[PDB]
Amino acid sequence: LIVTQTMKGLDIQKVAGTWYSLAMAASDISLLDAQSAPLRVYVEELKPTPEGDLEILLQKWENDECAQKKIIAEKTKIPAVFKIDALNENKVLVLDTDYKKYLLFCMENSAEPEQSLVCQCLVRTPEVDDEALEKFDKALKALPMHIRLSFN
Amino acid sequence: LIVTQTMKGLDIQKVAGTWYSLAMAASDISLLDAQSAPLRVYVEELKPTPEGDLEILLQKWENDECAQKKIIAEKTKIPAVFKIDALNENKVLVLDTDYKKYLLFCMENSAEPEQSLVCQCLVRTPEVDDEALEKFDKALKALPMHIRLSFN
């Protein structure tokens, strides 16, 4: 990705609260194949820290169960871009959000060979409005996604 | 599906030969989730019979292997629609084909509750032309697909 593809003027504090993963897409099918997929996670809550970092509560399938995992995405010099400084480095990129209805973001695996990207369309409530899905579609047209999922 | 959504004037004998599954889509994510998916099969060859029936050679993942399975789709009173008269009945619907480059078809699970549909975009050769993918997209717009896959 590029800086021109991330959001400008993002205020991390306003994304706080609950979210629902409405749709996902990835540049490689295996990234989201069967539940056990490492990047196939569902965002449940975003908790910005007073430090400007981003705490992410996620639910993932684990042994017939729905396991909760909390990861911390650290701010970087680039706004809208956060780093999960784990053994395996991943970046969280915020593409766009209106704070009150939707949020679009991607997770990238820099270590991997070519661009390994997985993006999600999040919404505040399961309301019957498709502006979020439309925006998601708009932002994904520029990227080479090989798999696309939509939750009911 | 409806009769107006299937192909008119299809000549089953002309689809004979090898094909490659280029893209798939389904009305329900679970239908194509992880390799083990029952409708996640790759068409390798179509063999029409002198009787007008359709023999389909498919490859599917099975125990770390790529298993070959041959199914027979029997003609019905409706052209372009074939029935796999197994314990679990499934129908094969041919949406459109130009015989020499692409073929679009769906497999439906009538027994299941709501419409359980899985469609595929097949091509004769892996040539660098996207008319097949475009047509596939065009035909899927009318259907409610929740997952979409594209092979490299």
Swiss-Prot record, chains A, B:
Belongs to the calycin superfamily. Lipocalin family. Keywords: Allergen, Disulfide bond, Milk protein, Retinol-binding, Secreted, Signal, Transport. It comes from Bos taurus. This is Beta-lactoglobulin. Alternate disulfide bonds occur in equal amounts in all variants examined. Under physiological conditions beta-lactoglobulin exists as an equilibrium mixture of monomeric and dimeric forms. Interaction with LMBR1L which mediates the endocytosis of LGB has been observed in PubMed:17991420, but not in PubMed:23964685. InterPro entries: Blactoglobulin, Calycin, Lipocalin, Lipocalin_CS, Lipocln_cytosolic_FA-bd_dom. Primary component of whey, it binds retinol and is probably involved in the transport of that molecule. GO terms for molecular function: identical protein binding; long-chain fatty acid binding; retinol binding. The gene is LGB.
